[PDB]
Point group: C3
Chain length 411, copies 3
């Protein structure tokens, strides 16, 4: 390669053809049941769009939740696509999905699009989507406190080889005072106070599930006020239970910091907000637990640059994705550029956070084009400096970014 | 449209031809008197340039204020345009105004530029400028605590139909301790305590001025430390008087948060600074007062992204403009993109904040070019996804952004 | 200048031809000895690359520090250049230096690059590098608390006309409890108690060193928690000694704010982190000490915009460079644009912070190209407004930005 033009095609092709390992989604293996969502109506009722439609429609939130799935979908399509152009990232995403499946957004024929999905099955749509989105591996969010999901694990169900488990623990860490009673009901003899017994039982709880799911990592989403150390249930659990168990099983600990839950409870999953967090807690964890691995992603735009700098300090920290409110072109671009400039290729640029199966298509299509453009710029800079990049080196670097860095980290 | 080039021309045409409603300025109906500032000398002595010239000139701030308007204008012209290239946004803006008026910056003939304004009346210039800037409606900042402005309203003088009033309340909310003495002198018997009597009289004051002004909204500028609820005069006035009255008359409450007043007293209007604010008070107001409408713009760059996320949570929140220190190309661009990507077209991209008539020319010229660029990108992305946008839908979306969204919100 | 194409040509040439005054580096006049670091092995072992290589290599940090300079350099070359493409800014910089020296990165022949340096003397390489990077003046960081540097000064060493001293005081201001003992060891009779006697001896220490080094400014790097006034050694020493001495000798005070030292002790120089600081202390200093001059650069991305706004308020504030974690293309670009949009040309866009002689080549090459682009955009915008910029004015502006603004400020 010795031309930006030539470089551009080589990079775009390597990126496009590179099978993706999506290390954080809200999808489930087909055999887990209806817990796996898919089709155009599910795409249109994605909570991102529920929030956006409420800024326009005169239909009360109560009434909205009272409508059927199809009715909610019809309202959103009309309000966000017909009455106004679907220029938002979330709306754009729905279109990218339709087009990717072979459907044509030009006609705006929602009924015809729907007819497409009605024909196929879950296992069938999964194969097609994973093919079209070029995703080889999907990491789920497995929460044992969720009855709809725990039932499948207790039944001995196993996800197919393309889906990996990740032990989600928000209820345990953030709501211990209520959750402790559920552990007791499950036979985990935790006591009123934090003593040897409570510690051991919570650890047994973690180990039992690690044994059941064989998770690639344990995870938790945290508030902007997250601090560590801390004399709170969360602080003690992390210190006395999670970290020791994680080290023993060499399992990474994923922290998604910055979410302020339910600032608008009526909106349900669309009612969460964001706040800038202190880096002190993460800094402490990284330094004081050198034998533990940490995967981190933050919600606030204002935490992104310093998070990158922290990654420069600690190799036991792997930063990943452009999470939630960060998953917009303007932010993805600035984040990926800051990350590559200070970390080279030693990071995971993105995850889809897909809640609806088809999203894998747009999530990866929208991000890959931006990442490819960033790569082209960086490769070109060193080419201009006289360096010679081979297509094989490109495919290698791209492989690390979209798949290898993750598996290498989880080990 | 089926090509970026084609799209670009149709988008730019739609943006340029769309009549603008400037929902926040410091301009006054021409019949109000000299408070309506205009001409090249007023543009050159805009406080933005006073701050900039003071970074170069050897002239003391005292000596500067002692100079006549023409002398100050002369100094600023020589210091910021001749001794160094006028590359700053504020300086660039002055040139943009001259050009729009038919004058030629190439000559740098300040004397000739001045001759242009001397042969014109204020009403004439108003028609000229509003025409050039394609501004159909101007929202003023009317402060009933200023003796001069108070005259116009008490005399029953109505403003030009193109100008709308906005009840500014900074003295009341931020300086109650000193303002209460004037409220009493005006017939509003507020006590030195916050009893029912005082509460009722403040409401009466607001109610009376809403009747006299028929404002599109009530407004206040707040410091980075703004909090709510709060046991202070401002906190009690907002809770017990402003919100109740605003809800009863269904008029929005505009909050411009982030200004740290007079960090450099000697600079006058040019001595204000900025600070990041907590989103807690705004979040509280939105959630706890669903029957009230809120217009918000923040001064800190670091508050922009989270403000957008907050708008996603509450439909009774309408964010607007790129205020003051945010009114620069680099910031206008990132802000507008973040806003459209997460809010689609459900927001008001800009306002001029013009203190001098002519500024409407450059403020909107400089902002429309950027907004057009963003729209082109967003339209092209969905266009690439197979969606087809009609030129009529473009005019519709452009109308919402530059005018409809505001009037719709103020109801 | 007719077209943007013609404009770009004249701007690029002026920027490239303009001799640079690098107002902050960690280089020393060659006659000072081996403390002046140079050659490819030094470039490769720059702490920026030590941090980066530790994110990839299996070699422990202890084993790394135990390796020879050559072995460390071989490791870094293989890990960051061969096993992965050298796309990070720091790695790209190493290549740019190689190319600028006439070597060829295409061969990846590290053994051959090393031969180029095995010949030359320090004096020759200084002449070579300064000519290539077109740097006419280099400001050093002279720390009288470092035993080695101190001996040179006490024994009469003077830098040649191309190098200027800057009195660095971190140990005095940030570690006074440890430093007071050393002051006493040097004849400065400070008491354990902070009183008039101690104040006078610290003032005498500063005076003696100002006289010995004839520094262009006194400097210190500060933590994100920096505040002023403050009841602490730093607060008292700045108030009682530094500011009065600086005013008396009319010497500016350079504050580099935002570094959190040694968050990862084992990484040595590569173990410092970043944090956002309050602007309160800087605002206070500028306002209350109008007779003192302050040079400021901040480490947090989130402090940049407000720092610019503060410069608009105070002429005794000169902001400079894109420091450390800010010295990446994505950040340099946004910072430089915000600065010019709000300050025109009244600022110092960059400094190299070079710790290794050859870095001057890449630091200035990478920054000049970015600064050139910003200038082209800004000049083009006013050209489109009708203004006509001459090539002489362009050369003047470029001279101000890269050299004149500094000498003028510290004059
Ligand atoms: O992308 C937005 C989401 O998926 C959130 O609703 C979700 O709660 C978040 O990503 C999480 O994993 O906690
Ligand atoms: O945009 C700069 C301005 O107009 C400020 O001086 C003004 O005080 C501010 O916009 C306000 O309305 O409080
Ligand atoms: O640019 C990175 C550096 O030179 C730092 O190591 C250095 O300590 C910093 O610039 C300073 O002068 O304190
Ligand atoms: Cl911030
Ligand atoms: Zn998620
Ligand atoms: Zn205003
Ligand atoms: Zn940007
Ligand atoms: Zn330095």
């Amino acid at each position: 390669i010795n031309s930006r033009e030539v470089l551009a095609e080589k990079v775009k092709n390597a990126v496009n053809n590179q099978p993706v390992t999506d290390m954080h989604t809200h999808l489930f293996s087909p055999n887990f049941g209806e817990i796996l969502l898919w089709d155009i109506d599910e795409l249109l009722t994605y909570h991102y769009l529920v929030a956006e439609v409420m800024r326009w429609t005169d239909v009360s939130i109560e009434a909205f939740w009272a409508m059927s799935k199809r009715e909610q979908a019809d309202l959103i399509w009309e309000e966000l696509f017909i009455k106004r152009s679907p220029v938002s990232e979330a709306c754009r995403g729905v279109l990218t999905c339709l087009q990717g499946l072979g459907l044509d957004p030009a006609t705006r024929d929602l009924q015809v699009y729907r007819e497409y999905f009605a024909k196929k099955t879950s296992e069938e749509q999964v194969d097609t989507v994973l093919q079209l989105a070029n995703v080889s591996d999907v990491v789920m969010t497995n929460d044992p406190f969720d009855d709809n999901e725990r039932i499948s694990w207790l039944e001995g169900k196993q996800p197919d080889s393309r889906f990996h488990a990740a032990l989600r623990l928000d209820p345990l860490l953030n709501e211990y005072e209520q959750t402790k009673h559920r552990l007791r009901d499950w036979g985990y003899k935790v006591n009123d106070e934090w003593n040897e017994g409570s510690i051991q039982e919570v650890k047994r709880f973690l180990t039992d599930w690690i044994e059941r799911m064989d998770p690639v990592y344990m995870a938790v989403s945290l508030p902007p006020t997250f601090s560590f150390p801390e004399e709170s249930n969360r602080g003690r659990i992390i210190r006395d239970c999670l970290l020791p168990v994680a080290e023993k099983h060499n399992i990474p600990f994923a922290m998604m910091i910055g979410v302020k839950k339910r600032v608008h409870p009526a909106l349900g999953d669309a009612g969460d907000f964001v706040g800038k967090a202190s880096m002190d807690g993460v800094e402490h964890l990284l330094r004081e637990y050198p034998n533990n691995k940490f995967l981190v992603t933050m919600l606030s735009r204002e935490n992104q640059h310093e998070l990158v700098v922290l990654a420069r300090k600690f190799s036991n920290l792997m930063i990943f994705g452009c999470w939630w409110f960060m998953n917009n072109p303007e932010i993805i671009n600035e984040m990926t550029r800051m990350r590559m400039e200070m970390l080279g290729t030693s990071f995971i640029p993105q995850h889809s956070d897909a809640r609806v199966l088809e999203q894998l298509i747009y999530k990866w299509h929208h991000s890959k084009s931006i990442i490819a453009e960033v790569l082209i710029d960086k490769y070109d800079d060193i080419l201009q400096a006289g360096w010679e990049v081979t297509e094989e080196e490109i495919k290698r670097d791209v492989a690390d970014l979209f798949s290898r860095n993750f598996w290498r980290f989880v080990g």
